[model samples]
Target: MNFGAFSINPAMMAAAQAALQSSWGMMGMLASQQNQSGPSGNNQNQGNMQ
Candidate 1:
């Protein structure tokens, strides 16, 4: 069975669920790192231009 972009098979569904759950941690870490550096970099650049 197909649910739009996903399959309804039990094994495939479990794997997909695991992948989705595991990725959240990595995504959160990436966002945290980006937030830490992104604003600081922009602020420094703006200060240098002043």
Candidate 2:
């Protein structure tokens, strides 16, 4: 079943390259939104405030 992988190696490389390029743009976009969803993740600082 895995024998087909060898035959499609060339196409796989092309598809992988295209996929990597697309994923990078998405990854960079997602990077901006990271940690923005929650800065207060239950640290002891909040408890001391009261």
Candidate 3:
């Protein structure tokens, strides 16, 4: 849950936590955010791995 630089980015961590709470893999939410033009270009893509 605590990944290096991610630990420093409160916003990113918060987003990740929120996504997890919604039953979405962190990467799925990240991709959604990227498509929606959210913040950074960080995409976990955990769902893709599945």
After superposing candidate 3, which stretches have Cα over 4 Å from the reference?
Answer: 1-8, 23-50
Q: What is the C-alpha RMSD of each candidate to the true structure, in Å?
A: 7.7, 7.4, 16.6
Per-residue lDDT tens digits for candidate 1, residues 1-50, read 54556534588777776788668767777887875665456645355555
What tens digits encode model 2's per-residue C-alpha lDDT throughout 1-50? Answer: 45665464578777777788778867777888784655565565555345
Model 3: per-residue Cα lDDT over 1-50, one tens digit each: 56686346578778878767666676676677776755343465443433
Query: For model 3, what is the alpha-carbon lDDT of residue 25?
Result: 70
Runs of candidate 2 with Cα error greater than 4 angstroms are: 1-21, 35-38, 41-50
The 10-residue segment of model 1 with minimum total lDDT is: 38-47
Which ten contiguous residues of candidate 2 have the minimum total lDDT?
A: 41-50
Error of 1 at 36 (Å): 9.3
Clashing pairs in 2: none
Q: What is the lDDT of residue 20 in candidate 2?
A: 89
Candidate order by decreasing lDDT = 2, 1, 3
User: In what order do the candidates fall by TM-score, top score first?
Assistant: 2, 1, 3
Against the unseen true structure, what C-alpha lDDT does each candidate score? 0.67, 0.67, 0.64
